[PDB]
Amino acid sequence: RFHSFSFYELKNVTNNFDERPISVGGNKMGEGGFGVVYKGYVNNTTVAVKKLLKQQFDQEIKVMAKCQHENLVELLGFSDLCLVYVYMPNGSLLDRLSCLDGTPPLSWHMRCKIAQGAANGINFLHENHHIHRDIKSANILLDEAFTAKISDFGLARAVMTSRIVGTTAYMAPEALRGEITPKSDIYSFGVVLLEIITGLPAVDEHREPQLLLDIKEEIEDEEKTIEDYIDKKMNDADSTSVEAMYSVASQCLHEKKNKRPDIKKVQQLLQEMT
Numbered sequence: 001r002f003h004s005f006s007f008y009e010l011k012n013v014t015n016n017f018d019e020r021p022i023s024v025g026g027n028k029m030g031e032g033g034f035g036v037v038y039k040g041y042v043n044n045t046t047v048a049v050k051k052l053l054k055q056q057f058d059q060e061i062k063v064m065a066k067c068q069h070e071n072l073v074e075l076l077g078f079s080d081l082c083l084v085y086v087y088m089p090n091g092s093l094l095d096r097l098s099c100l101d102g103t104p105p106l107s108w109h110m111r112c113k114i115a116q117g118a119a120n121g122i123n124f125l126h127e128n129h130h131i132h133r134d135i136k137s138a139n140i141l142l143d144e145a146f147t148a149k150i151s152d153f154g155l156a157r158a159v160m161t162s163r164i165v166g167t168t169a170y171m172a173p174e175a176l177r178g179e180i181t182p183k184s185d186i187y188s189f190g191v192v193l194l195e196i197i198t199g200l201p202a203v204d205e206h207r208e209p210q211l212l213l214d215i216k217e218e219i220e221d222e223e224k225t226i227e228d229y230i231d232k233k234m235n236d237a238d239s240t241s242v243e244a245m246y247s248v249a250s251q252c253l254h255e256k257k258n259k260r261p262d263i264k265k266v267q268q269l270l271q272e273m274t
């Protein structure tokens with residue numbers, strides 16, 4: 001179970017929900033469309049407090065109670081709505097690929113383990129009949145050992161929908177059309193694999209192509225190769241393993257949902273790669 005916190009307890013851990021950035025000397029880690037994230041200190045232990053909508057608060061608690069895995073973020077408690085999680089000292093994979101706030105580039109070696117971990121996390125969710133619905137590098141967090149933890153199960157589902165949710169740059173064509181399927185999570189994971197290989201954001205208005213997933217077509221049509229796109233901020237990449245991770249991403253990014261490999265095959269392929 002999770003700890004049932006009171007709003008005043010969580011207010012003082014966050015310096016009265018200090019909306020100032022940490023860099024200036026505040027408690028604001030970042031913000032999403034659902035709520036703001038705050039660094040909190042609970043008896044010398046560092047936590048992430050998410051002050052938020054109620055449907056997503058409950059869904060996150062419902063999925064977190066059912067799903068416990070090495071490769072998922074851990075929820076510690078809940079409270080105006082607040083969610084308390086284990087603090088991830090190495091933020092998100094998106095931030096680490098961007099070398100945000102002057103952090104060093106991730107090696108090919110670390111990137112491989114992060115992809116393997118991320119796939120184990122998705123495998124566990126699908127084994128437990130859960131579709132994440134928002135797989136992206138901003139939702140892959142990194143612990144003190146750079147272990148991948150899948151986060152944000154507010155949109156998760158245990159099929160069609162009139163309320164199409166998720167990130168546009170990462171979404172499968174059928175997901176954009178209203179279908180809910182674990183196959184769409186596979187597609188989104190392929191985009192994450194492309195971000196891991198290239199170090200490029202999934203969408204860039206200042207780029208050709210604007211969407212990262214479109215580099216698959218540039219490569220198939222022999223205009224460019226994977227070598228042309230490998231992140232130059234690594235010194236330990238080898239064409240063999242880079243090509244094996246690209247082949248997995250290529251397979252995930254198939255337009256026909258049924259032609260995509262299941263997460264068990266994805267997990268199996270990333271294992272063979274190392």
Ligand SMILES: CN1C(=O)C[C@@H]2CN([C@H]3CC[C@H](Nc4ncnc5[nH]cc(C6CCOCC6)c45)CC3)CC[C@@H]21
Nearest residue numbers: 029030031037048050073085086087088091092151152
């Ligand atoms: C200033 N920035 C912004 O405004 C946007 C940019 C990205 N941000 C992120 C880094 C990751 C962080 N999230 C956590 N950070 C540590 N430990 C955690 N445990 C559980 C979480 C999740 C919280 C959400 O709900 C799901 C669980 C989490 C949210 C802000 C950093 C830099 C940039």
